[PDB]
Paper text:
Immunization with DNA plasmid coding for the salivary protein SALO (formerly known as LJM19) was shown to protect hamsters against the fatal outcome of visceral leishmaniasis and this protection was correlated with the induction of a Th1 cellular immune response. In this study we present the production and crystal structure of SALO genetically engineered in yeast as part of efforts to develop it as a recombinant vaccine for leishmaniasis.
The structure of rSALO(P) was solved by S-SAD at Cu-Kalpha to 1.94 Å and refined to Rfactor 17%. SALO has three predicted human CD4+ T cell epitopes on surface exposed helices. Immunization with rSALO(P) produces a delayed type hypersensitivity response in C57BL/6 mice, suggesting rSALO(P) lacked anti-complement activity but retained its immunogenicity.
Author numbering: 1 to 95
Write the structure that this text describes.
Amino acid sequence: EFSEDCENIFHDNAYLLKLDCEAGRVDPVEYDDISDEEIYEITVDVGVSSEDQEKVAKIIRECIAQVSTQDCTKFSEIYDCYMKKKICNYYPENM
């Protein structure tokens, strides 16, 4: 699908964070929320439409809020929410 690149990138980040979290490099409780600046940076700054930003924005916040898991598996669970919500359909094919 058209979506594989976005998906792979989110997949990669999740996995990296997981590995780092395992390594005791990251703390899963800092991932309990997210700023508007981070959001812009992973939406518009990378090809999400201005018009669509809030729509992606909502999925990210819902997902983050929905994941009350606070171990290293949080990173992977959040990614699961993002795929479940089809977040990648809002991004361009190449990125």
